[PDB]
């Protein structure tokens, strides 16, 4: 059943590109997630209660879409069976030369993502494109708050970590 996210919703992914950075997904509902960026240039961004079209393409494969307060679109593949990650980001040229001004919890933030977005400049839109390794996979069940609470800076230097 294509239309049945049972598998998916209260899912929490821990995934894991090539270089060894560590991401976060945490499926909140059938339309909604966290998420939470460890490392790299968006190192420490995280946000809570984004709005995405979560929809089932295969047995255990996953996609969820959003678009973000930056202007930043995302869809995102999730293989549970064949722990395959795949992302494409399309991300504003404004955030390609000034990523640092995104690195927040956004949640506290969103006018002045929405004043960046109308300010810098859109375009040229840069689409990332990169397969991640599932690293680690774990069921917290729907809205639960308690799954992406904090900053990435603030877990275990250890982390993951059960
Ligand atoms: C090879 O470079 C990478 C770029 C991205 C895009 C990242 C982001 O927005 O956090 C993610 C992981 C990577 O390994």
Same mark, same amino acid.
């Given at each position: 059943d294509k239309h049945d996210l049972s598998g998916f919703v209260g899912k929490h992914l821990v995934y894991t590109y090539d270089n060894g950075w560590n991401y976060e997904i945490y499926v909140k509902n059938d339309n909604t997630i966290d998420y939470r960026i460890h490392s790299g240039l968006v190192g420490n961004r995280w946000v809570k209660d984004q709005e995405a079209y979560i929809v089932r393409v295969g047995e255990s494969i996953y996609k969820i879409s959003w678009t973000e307060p930056t202007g930043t679109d995302v869809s995102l593949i999730v293989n549970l069976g064949d722990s395959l990650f795949h992302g494409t980001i399309f991300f504003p040229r404004w955030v390609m030369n000034n +990523?640092? +001004?995104?690195?927040?919890?956004?949640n506290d933030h969103i006018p002045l993502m929405n004043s960046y977005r109308e300010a810098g400049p859109a375009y040229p839109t840069e689409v990332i494109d990169e397969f991640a390794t599932i690293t680690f996979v774990r069921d917290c069940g729907a809205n639960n708050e308690s799954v992406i609470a904090c900053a990435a800076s603030e877990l275990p230097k250890n982390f993951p970590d059960n």
């Open positions: +990523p640092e +001004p995104t690195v927040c919890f956004q």
